[PDB]
């Protein structure tokens, strides 16, 4: 059960409160489809504040009896230690085991186990152990649940190795495929794509009062992309070039008012004065999510590949940062923000999920071929901090009995009913 005001995620895409949710309601299941609300667990107790351990942190406050959904890596190593005179073939593993708490109960949780045998007995077994562990599960981790207060029962190693997980938003709206079906009756099946990329393109190095946006001259692929896309909607991308010495070539997009600036406002990529990331986009049709994203990177982001692919973007307007930090997660990317010299930074990563988003970019050093096969948008983990808190009211949302019992908080975090 969760504290008053715990923003939630409805199966339609909307964000109601845990308190305001009524019975017969649908909440967002960690798989796209909905979950039916039936009860409305009320009461009081100690409340625990879960907070991502590391300022765009994933946090949520719950009831001390709340089953946090978590994961813990499997693990097995066969070393060789000597117990004062006798050398054993120790086998350490992470496995399901019990430990009693001070309440009374026997809690079912994960523990680090050790099983040592003297050498001479031949590691023939020390091995068979390691091999049984190794082919017992089809995943490389344990999906399990422990109540908020029982986290302290975890022994060091296992605890730091345990994390909660937020889920991508596999759910797709279309407020975007629509906003367009109100001006044309002859606009390409590429409608959404092209408009998302330009829209993205507008958030990076854009300008607010005209569909004009200071683009780079040095990028002779971005140029084509920009142009070829400018016409895709219905606009020639006149500009400067071969007249106007500098690298940041201002570009103007006309209707050869203009449906571009009509989009920047209708859908609100310019909420009152300063630019802005609309939150409806988070739960909108994926490709538009990735495509819009592509634009923004192509605009003022940069891609580095040192310890894996990862793209950084910059913004000043938090009204955008916060916007991106969620449009990002909505897809499955892993994200973090760092504040520099007024200036914000959004680091994104995720392998294929990020590729799907970068194979749509066009800027010289930002493209990247699309995935090599099919790829799923797995839930992403996040280690955290749990702080014991006074007492207060709380409100659960008990789901059915033939369902998973998990639903998504507003911040994509996967909590248990």
């Amino acid at each position: 059960s969760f504290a008053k005001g715990t923003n939630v995620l409805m199966a339609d895409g909307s964000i109601e409160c845990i308190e305001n949710i009524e019975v017969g309601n649908k909440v967002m299941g960690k798989d796209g489809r909905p979950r039916e609300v039936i009860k409305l667990p009320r009461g009081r107790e100690t409340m625990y504040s879960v907070v991502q351990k590391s300022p765009e942190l994933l946090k949520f406050t719950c009831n001390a009896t709340n089953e946090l959904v978590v994961r813990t890596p499997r693990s097995v190593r066969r070393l060789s230690r000597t117990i004062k005179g006798v050398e054993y073939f120790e086998v350490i593993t992470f496995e399901m085991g019990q430990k009693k708490a001070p309440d009374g109960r026997i809690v079912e949780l994960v523990k680090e186990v050790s099983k040592s045998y003297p050498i001479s007995e031949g590691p023939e077994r020390a091995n068979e152990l390691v091999e049984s562990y190794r082919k017992a599960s089809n995943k490389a981790y344990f999906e399990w649940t422990i109540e908020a207060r029982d986290l302290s029962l975890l022994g060091s190693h296992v605890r730091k190795a345990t994390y909660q997980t937020y889920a991508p938003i596999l759910y797709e709206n279309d407020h975007f495929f629509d906003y367009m079906q109100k001006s044309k009756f002859h606009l390409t099946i590429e409608g959404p794509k092209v408009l998302a990329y330009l829209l993205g393109l507008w958030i990076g190095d854009g300008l607010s009062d005209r569909a004009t946006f200071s683009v780079d001259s040095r990028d002779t692929s971005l140029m084509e992309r920009v142009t070829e896309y400018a016409e895709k909607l219905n606009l020639c991308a006149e500009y400067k070039d071969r007249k106007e010495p500098q690298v940041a070539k201002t570009v103007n997009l006309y209707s050869k008012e203009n449906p571009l600036w009509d989009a920047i406002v209708g859908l609100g990529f310019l909420k009152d004065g300063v630019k802005n990331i609309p939150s409806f986009l988070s739960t909108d049709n994926i490709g538009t999510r990735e495509t819009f994203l592509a634009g923004l990177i192509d605009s003022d982001g940069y891609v580095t590949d040192e310890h894996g692919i990862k793209a950084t973007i910059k913004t000043i307007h938090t009204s955008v940062r916060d916007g991106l930090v969620s449009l990002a997660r909505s897809l499955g990317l892993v994200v973090s923000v760092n504040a520099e010299p007024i200036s914000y930074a959004i680091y994104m990563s995720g392998g294929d999920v990020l590729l799907n988003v970068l194979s749509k970019c066009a800027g010289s050093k930002k493209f990247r071929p699309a995935p090599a096969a099919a790829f799923a948008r797995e839930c992403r983990g996040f280690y955290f901090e749990l702080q014991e808190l006074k007492e207060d009211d709380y409100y659960g949302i008990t789901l059915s009995d033939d369902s998973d019992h998990q639903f998504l908080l507003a911040n994509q975090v996967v909590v248990h009913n």
Partner: peptide, 7 residues
């Protein structure tokens, strides 16, 4: 008695 679900 519960916990956002009850057994």
């Amino acid at each position: 008695y519960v916990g956002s679900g009850e057994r």
